[PDB]
Amino acid sequence: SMKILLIGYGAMNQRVARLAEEKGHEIVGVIENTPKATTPYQQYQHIADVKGADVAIDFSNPNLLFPLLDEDFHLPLVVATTGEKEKLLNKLDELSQNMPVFFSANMSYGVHALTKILAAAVPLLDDFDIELTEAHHNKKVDAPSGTLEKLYDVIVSLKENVTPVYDRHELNEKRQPQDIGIHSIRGGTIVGEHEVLFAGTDETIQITHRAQSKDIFANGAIQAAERLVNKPNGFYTFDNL
Amino acid sequence: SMKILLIGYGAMNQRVARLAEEKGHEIVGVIENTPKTPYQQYQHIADVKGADVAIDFSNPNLLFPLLDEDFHLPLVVATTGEKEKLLNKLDELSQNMPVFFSANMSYGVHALTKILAAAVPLLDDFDIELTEAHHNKKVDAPSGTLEKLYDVIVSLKENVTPVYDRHELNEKRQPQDIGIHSIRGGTIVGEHEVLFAGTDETIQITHRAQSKDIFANGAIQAAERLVNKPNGFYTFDNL
Amino acid sequence: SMKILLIGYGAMNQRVARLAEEKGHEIVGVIENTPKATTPYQQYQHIADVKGADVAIDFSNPNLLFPLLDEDFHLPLVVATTGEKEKLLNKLDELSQNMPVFFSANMSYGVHALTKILAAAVPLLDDFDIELTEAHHNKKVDAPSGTLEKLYDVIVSLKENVTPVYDRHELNEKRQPQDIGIHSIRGGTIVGEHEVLFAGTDETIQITHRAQSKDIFANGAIQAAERLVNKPNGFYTFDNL
Amino acid sequence: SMKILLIGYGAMNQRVARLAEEKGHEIVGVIENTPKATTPYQQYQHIADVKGADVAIDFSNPNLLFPLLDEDFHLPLVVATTGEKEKLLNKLDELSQNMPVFFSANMSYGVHALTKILAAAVPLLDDFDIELTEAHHNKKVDAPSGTLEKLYDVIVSLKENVTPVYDRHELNEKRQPQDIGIHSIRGGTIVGEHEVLFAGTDETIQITHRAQSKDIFANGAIQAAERLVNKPNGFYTFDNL
């Protein structure tokens, strides 16, 4: 049983709350920028005021930096964020000197494992053509997904030349070996599917990750918290947790 | 079994020859641009004595002058050149003989189109995305087969808009959009997927070709059915 | 705002309750075969006693047929059943003379459509071998799923001869044309996937339904209820609701 | 441009001939146990007689051991065989002292890559349930496929207490973490597809190899040959080539 402090209480930490309680953990406090009525937990403005806490789970945004600026707490921190990271990472870097700090932009251990599996696959399949596909719900505007970009980056790090091909319609060019076709499917409520296709001579290898729920990220944070609580002070990612 | 006349003798009618003979049929004649070939060479369709049917995989330059002549034979026509003028001549000939035309000779692909036709009115609240995959030598995109599937949807769904590239487009999907995706790589013979994505569920219908023999086999299947037809114009829809 | 009577309070109607309340509907009663203290709604034994109910939602099994045997009530009924249905459907027919009655085995419009798409596919694909696969979470004990059996039954109705084949490792016999291989994948938290494979000469056609959440069934029922309350008396399915 | 000697001219080396010529390689000779006039290449009885060969590709059987018994040749050898291997492997060991020798029962490089990708995946996904599926044409009698067995063997080497589950129909047992479900799909002319499913909490990872034709084995031998000519004497498999 962990006593968990939630930094932020948006959609993601609402998932964390539900799943943590299912696992027998307890939410002992919430720190939010706009403390909401009907948030069913004790509200705080400082980490140090939440006694009993074993760990904090923080799906961060710029408005949730404030509790990390206090200098009177020592607590395991599990932190995620998207977009701007520099200021936050500088602060987490400082905090890691005095407590265990875990950071991952993407909290899915499955997606982390996918990237490592892809990394292993690439040098083995250098003669194969690569095509990347992602599918997401019909509310997603940006294309391609950040996760597709992450997979693409893994490939780039293991290839000499890579050229992304976003649309073949009326392109009328012959595929070249450096090309990687990028395909963004949108529809329904699809949580997130990512496929790496390797196409060779009369054989293909496909590696496909399919998310069933955004609970994968909440669960990822909780499972990270469960490992972090016993770690010495320092900075941790999925690579060394 | 059948006695078959082959109009044109490229890769595809070579497949037809191999596959027809394996089925117990015999190739009684070939009409070609520049002859080579283990079969008897003809210049006219009327010349081919005991022919039951012609299977055509050629081009307008070879076919059009042959159609303009005086003959009576069931025709399986797969030529995809100059569709407008070809269908005009095929229409005229169908008054006097059984005439089958399909731009795509795969019976599996036909079944896919009919399965799609059934699916669409049943899934009107589902978002439709079309994906096709082909080998790394294919230049045009999307495939003609994807276009055929899209045409089926258009006939059954109002105000359809195709969406080809979402990268940096920054628009929200609209229910009338159909996303179109062309995968290229390796030696993939041809795979076509229709995705219907609804609230918390998906239905996918996928055709995957293992060999171009499906097209040759489809033309043979059409020929076998066509010899038992009255005069008229046929496609897989009414054959 | 509908006032809903729940017939049965297993996992599915528990989900219906949560989703219905989220939508602003009210659960005004429950009828259970064996009432539970943990059931947080007023227990009843007869539909006629549930003052102010607008509709009943019934994920049925043989132990929940009982309230449908009363002859002193008039209420819109939304009824599902995954097992045997003859007895139930005979009763629903009789009830439909005096009230609106909606039936769906699974309460998923998508799964219903799957069966109809399959029905269209079978006669077109006479020369194709059929294989049926389903995948479900690691807590599912029965195999194959009732939905696979439903698909199998559709195929049986459209073919002269069908033989189910369950274990080719044990059998070690070459495939016969009448054979339909049945495959049951279990793992993780997979909500439910069903695939029909048609395998022909040098080509295959696959039809695959994938459920992302059991919400499809519970929302299916609620949406059917929301509509049925404004229908005249009679029997309705997804085909004619 | 490799000059290739074919040992045997059955279906597989007929594929090698076509693919080699496509790649711009040259078939400089054929050694057959019973020479046939339909073989469109120069027939030989001894490897040493073949003018300018760079490599031999040998899809072996008991009737094709004979050219390996000569003691007057030094040539890179790429060799496959099915079933009984002892006598052949003993001879290849002897030859490997004096020339580069490559042996693989399965010549598909894609299949080798799959096994290595699987090996990387397993320790990263130890909280995921594993299910193995293979699909083959309707003439395949044995189930499961040898390739599925090889994948299962990889997993056994990296787990403990693994148990295969071949049929869940009417079994009525809950899945256990050490279980691996085994599924053999048979239909049409499917050349061979193998899937490893890893099913976790609200996420799955699938790794799938799909063969389009038996050219994959022929191409694999040619690819092995292209690499082998640049090796010193020794015995090689895909693991150390």
CA–CA dist B107, B219 (Å, integer): 9
Type and span of the H or E element at B202? strand B201-209
Is A213 touching C (CB cutoff 8 A)? yes
Give φ, ψ of D238 to 5 degrees.
-60, -25
> Most distant CA pair in chain B: distance in Å?
64
Token reading at C223: 């949406």
Find out whether A38 is annotated in a ligand binding site.
Answer: no
Closest CA of chain B from D189, distance in Å? 9
Distance of CA C163 to the CA centre of its chain: 24
**Are residues C199 and D187 in contact, defined by beta-carbon separation less than 8 angstroms?**
yes
Q: Are B97 and B76 in contact (CB under 8 A)?
A: no
Write out the DSSP string of B60-109.
Answer: HHHHHHHHTS-----EEE---SSHHHHHHHHHHHTTTSEEEE-SS--HHH
Q: How many Å apart are CA C200 and CA C208, to the nearest integer? A: 17
Question: CB within 8 A of D43, min separation 6: which ones?
Answer: D29, D30, D31, D32, D35
Reported structure resolution in angstroms:
1.8
> Could you tell me which of D8, D5, D189 has the C-alpha nearest to residue D81?
D8
Q: Are C203 and B186 in contact (CB under 8 A)?
A: no
Q: Pairing mode, if any, of strands A203-211 and D203-211? A: antiparallel
Work out whether strand A179-186 and strand A129-136 pair parallel, antiparallel, or are unpaired. parallel
> By three-state DSSP, how is residue B30 classified?
strand
Report the DSSP beta bridge partners of residue C79: C58, C103
> CB contact, 8 Å: B158 with chain A?
no
- State the Cα angle at C127 between C123 and C128, rounded to 5°: 90
Flag if C168 and D188 touch (Cβ within 8 Å): no
- Report d(CA C61, CA A135) in Å as an integer: 37
Q: Quote the tokens at residue A98.
A: 């005095």
- And the tokens for C93? 């027919």
- CB-CB: which of D109, D125, D212 is closest to A113? D125
Question: CA A113 from chain center: how many Å?
Answer: 12
Would an 8 Å CB–CB cutoff place B187 in contact with chain D?
yes
Cis (ω within 30 of 0) for the bond into C177?
Answer: no
The answer to whether residues B225 and B110 touch, using CB atoms and an 8 Å cutoff, is: no
Q: Tell me if chain A has a CB within 8 Å of the CB of C212.
A: yes
In degrees and rounded to multiples of 5, residue B98 shows phi and psi of -70, 130
A168, A172, A202: residue with CB nearest B184 = A168
For residue D43, what are the CA distances in angstroms to A155, D7, D169?
A: 46, 10, 55
Burial class (CB in 10 A: 0-12, 13-18, 19+), B168: exposed
- Give the 3-state secondary structure of residue B115: helix
User: Strand, coil or helix: what is D79?
Assistant: strand
Of B37, B46, B41, B33, the closest CA to residue B14 belongs to B37
The beta-carbon contacts of A14-21 under 8 Å, at least 24 apart in sequence, are A15/A214, A15/A215, A15/A217, A15/A218, A16/A57, A16/A59, A16/A218, A16/A221, A16/A222, A17/A41, A18/A218, A19/A215, A19/A218, A19/A219, A19/A222, A20/A222
On whether the CB atoms of residues D221 and D57 are closer than 8 A, the answer is: yes
| Cα gap C173→B191, rounded to integer Å | 31
Closest Cα partner for A31 from A1, A70, A76, A64?
A: A64
Q: List the one residue out of D151, D155, D183 whose CA is nearest residue C186.
A: D183
Out of A25, A46, A91, A136, the active site residue is A136
- DSSP run (H or E) holding D94: helix D86-95
The three state secondary structure string of chain A is: CCEEEEECCCHHHHHHHHHHHHCCCEEEEEECCCCCCCCCCCEECCHHHCCCCCEEEEECCHHHCHHHHCCCCCCCEEEECCCCCHHHHHHHHHHCCCCEEEECCCCCHHHHHHHHHHHHHHHHCCCCEEEEEEEECCCCCCCCCHHHHHHHHHHHHHCCCCEEECCCCCCCCCCCCCEEEEEEEECCCCCEEEEEEEECCCEEEEEEEEECCCHHHHHHHHHHHHHHCCCCCEEECCCCC
Q: What distance in Å separates the CA atoms of residue B65 and residue A111, rounded to the nearest whole number? A: 61
Residue A136: strand pairing partners: A186
Do B203 and C201 lie within an 8 Å CB cutoff? no
Whether C113 and B122 lie within 8 Å, measured CB to CB: yes
Which residue type occupies D224? Answer: A
C42, C28 in Cβ contact below 8 A?
A: yes
Amino acid, single-letter form, for residue C15:
R
Of A169, A188, A200, the CB nearest to B197: A188
Task: Return the number of other C-beta atoms located less than 10 Å from residue C46's C-beta.
Answer: 12
Taking alpha carbons only, the member of A18, A8, A2 closest to residue A214 is: A18
Show residues of chain A in contact with B190, CB under 8 Å. Answer: none
Looking at the partner chain, which of C189, C190, C212 has a beta carbon nearest the beta carbon of A191?
A: C212
Identity of the residue numbered A71: E
User: How far is residue B184 CA from its own chain's centroid?
Assistant: 21
CA distance C219 to chain B (A): 10
Q: Which among D120, D205, D223 is the nearest to A120, CB-wise?
A: D120
Q: Which residue type occupies B225?
A: R
Instruction: Tell how strand D3-7 and strand D26-31 pair up.
Output: parallel
How, if at all, do strands A3-7 and A43-44 pair?
unpaired
Check CB contact under 8 Å for D110 and A207.
no
Q: CA–CA separation, B12 vs C54, rounded Å?
A: 65
How far apart CA B217 and CA B207 sit, in angstroms, is 16
Count contacts between A and D (CB, < 8 Å).
92
Q: Which two tokens stand for residue A28?
A: 């002992």
The Cα A182–Cα C187 span in angstroms is 30
Nearest to B112 among C116, C205, C212 (CB): C205
Structure tokens of B237?
A: 């829809």
Interface contact B111-C117, CB threshold 8 A:
no
- Mark yes or no for CB contact B115/C120 under 8 Å: yes
**A146, two tokens:** 């950040």
CB D201 within 8 A of CB D188: no
Dist. CA D92–CA C78, nearest whole Å = 72
C-alpha A148, offset from chain centre? 12
C230 touches chain A (CB under 8 A): no
Here the tokens at position C68 are 């449908």
Distance from the C220 Cα atom to the nearest Cα atom in chain B, whole angstroms: 10
- DSSP state, residue B43: S
Q: Quickly list DSSP for D157-207.
A: HHSSS-EEE---TTT-----TTEEEEEEEE-TT--EEEEEEEEETTEEEEE
Taking the Cβ of residue D48 and every Cβ of chain B, the question of whether any pair is shorter than 8 Å is answered with no
Task: Give the alpha-carbon dihedral of C197, D175, A215, A17, to 10 degrees.
Answer: 160
Q: Does D213 contact chain A (CB < 8 Å)?
A: yes
HEC per residue, B136-194? CCCCCCCCHHHHHHHHHHHHHCCCCEEECCCCCCCCCCCCCEEEEEEEECCCCCEEEEE
Neighbours of chain C (3+ CB pairs under 8 A): A, B, D
Provide the token pair at B70: 């005086």
3-state secondary structure chain C: CCEEEEECCCHHHHHHHHHHHHCCCEEEEEECCCCCCCCCCCECCCHHHCCCCCEEEEECCHHHCHHHHCCCCCCCEEEECCCCCHHHHHHHHHHCCCCEEEECCCCCHHHHHHHHHHHHHHHHCCCCEEEEEEEECCCCCCCCCHHHHHHHHHHHHHCCCCEEECCHHHHCCCCCCCEEEEEEEECCCCCEEEEEEEECCCEEEEEEEEECCCHHHHHHHHHHHHHHCCCCCEEECCCCC
Residue in chain A nearest B144 by alpha carbon? A169
Pair type for strands A192-199 and A129-136: antiparallel
Q: Between chains, do C188 and D167 touch, taking CB under 8 Å as contact?
A: no
Distance linking the first and last C-alpha atoms of chain D: 20
Given a contact cutoff of 8 angstroms between Cβ atoms, the answer to whether A183 and A125 are in contact is no
Note whether C172 contacts D139, CB cutoff 8 Å: no
Question: Listing from the earlier edge strand, what are the strands of the sheet with B190-198?
Answer: B161-163, B177-184, B127-134, B190-198, B201-209, C203-211, C192-199, C129-136, C179-186, C163-165
What are the b/e assignments for B101-131, b being 16+ CB within 10 Å? bbebbbbbbbbbbbbbbbbbebbeebbbbbb
End-to-end, the C-alpha distance of chain B in Å comes to 19
User: To which residue do tokens 């009432």 refer?
Assistant: C35
Token pair, residue D93, equals 């060991």
DSSP B41: B
How far is the C-alpha of D238 from the C-alpha of D36, rounded, in Å?
A: 32
H or E, element range at B216: helix B213-226
Q: Which residues of D touch C174 (CB under 8 A)?
A: 138-139, 141
Contacts of C20 (CB under 8 A, 6+ apart): C2, C4, C26, C27, C222
Nearest-CA neighbor of D124 among D196, D210, D175? Answer: D196
The rounded distance, in Å, linking the Cα atoms of A97 and C99 is 70
Separation of alpha carbons B31 and B87, rounded Å: 21
**Partners of D5 in the β-ladder:** D29, D56
Judge whether C108 is closer than 8 Å to chain B, CB to CB. yes
Tell me whether the omega of the peptide bond preceding residue B142 falls within 30 degrees of 0, making it cis.
Answer: yes
Question: Domains in chain A and their CATH numbers?
Answer: 1-107+213-241 (3.40.50.720), 108-212 (3.30.360.10)
Nearest CA to CA, how far is C161 from chain B (Å)? Answer: 22
CB atoms within 10 A of CB B48: 21
Q: Is A147 annotated as a binding residue?
A: yes
Residue D155, Ramachandran bin (φ over 0: left; ψ between -120 and 50: alpha; else beta): alpha
Cross-chain Cβ contact D206/A208 below 8 Å: yes
Q: List chains adjacent to chain A, taking adjacency as at least 3 C-beta pairs closer than 8 Å.
A: B, C, D
Which amino acids of D are annotated as binding site for NAD(+), given as ranges?
Answer: 80-82, 104-107
Inter-residue contact A238 to A42 (CB < 8 Å): no
The answer to whether D117 touches A205, Cβ cutoff 8 Å, is yes
Q: How far apart are CA B80 and CA A108, in angstroms?
A: 50
Q: Is any Cβ of chain A less than 8 angstroms from the Cβ of D211?
A: yes
- Specify whether the CB–CB gap between D5 and D46 falls below 8 A: no
B206 touches chain D (CB under 8 A): no
